[PDB]
From a paper:
Here we report a previously unknown budding yeast polarisome protein encoded by YFR016C, named actin-interacting protein 5 (Aip5). Aip5 is found to accelerate the formation of actin filaments in vitro through its C-terminal folded-domain (Aip5-C) and mediates actin cable assembly in cells. Structural studies by X-ray crystallography and biochemical assays have identified that Aip5-C is in a dimeric form, in which the dimer state and a loop region that directly binds to G-actin play essential roles in regulating actin assembly activity.
L1150 in the loop region is highly conserved among multiple pathogenic filamentous fungi homologs. To test the L1150 role in actin filament assembly, we generated a protein mutant Aip5-C-L1150A and additional mutations of the amino acids adjacent to the loop region, single mutants Aip5-C-N1162A and Aip5-C-S1165C, and one triple mutant Aip5-C-3m (L1150A, N1162A, S1165C). Of the three single mutants, Aip5-C-L1150A showed the most drastic reduction in the polymerization rate. Superposition of protomer A of Aip5-C and Aip5-C-3m structures showed an RMSD of 2.75 Å, which revealed missing electron density for the loop in Aip5-C-3m, indicating increased loop flexibility, whereas the superposition of protomer B showed an RMSD of 1.88 Å, which showed more similar conformations inside the well-folded region of Aip5-C. The Aip5-C-3m still formed a homodimer, however, and displayed significant conformational change when superposed with the native Aip5-C dimer. The hydrophobic contact established between two L1150 sites of Aip5-C promoters is, however, absent in the Aip-5-C-3m dimer. Furthermore, the loop sites in both protomers are far apart, with the heads of α1s pointing in opposite directions. Structural comparisons between Aip5-C and Aip5-C-3m suggest that the flexibility and/or the position of the loop plays a critical role in its actin assembly activities.
Numbering used by the authors:
A (entry chain B): 1134 to 1149, 1155 to 1233
B (entry chain A): 1131 to 1149, 1155 to 1233
The structure:
């Protein structure tokens, strides 16, 4: 039931090294997995910066955050989850 | 009144009703609400009877997607929300109305 509740939350690609190419791969991966998303640009989105600064524990951008601050992973973690065929689960079945 | 209405509205859940340009327009609404710091969740009228009924009853012909406050307070469809946001009055539309 975690799933239904999470599926109602917006998923964000946090963006702002290799920033654009990695952001493009996140866009392609989430699209291929039928995961809807929008961008938040930490260049101009102060709430986004706070969330990332508070939870990233050092992770480089870009990344994926569910809802207000359920940080899911940075680009490398998202790519690994996708390679494990478990991306929808990592995003919609967690916490 | 007014400040009272605001406080009561701050207790209400805000929803984006979604299911043409459905995906691109819904994306915009999400970005707009997010940029206005308005917390929200999605409702898919495809599988959500209440939301589907609410839209049918109150839209008066407006195309989806849209924004709904509480159970039945239709704030606007995507175009109205985009106009309100352009006018810098989206937050007033949502929190200062009965």
């Amino acid at each position: 039931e975690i799933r239904k509740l999470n599926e109602k939350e917006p998923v964000y690609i946090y963006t702002s090294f290799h920033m654009i190419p990695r952001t493009a791969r996140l866009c392609t991966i989430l699209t291929a997995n039928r995961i809807p998303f929008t961008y938040r640009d930490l260049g101009t989105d102060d709430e986004a910066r706070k969330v990332w600064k508070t939870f990233s524990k050092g992770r480089s951008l870009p990344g994926v955050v569910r809802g207000h601050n359920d940080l899911i992973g940075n680009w490398e973690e998202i790519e690994e989850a996708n390679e494990d065929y478990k991306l929808r689960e990592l995003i919609y079945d967690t916490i």
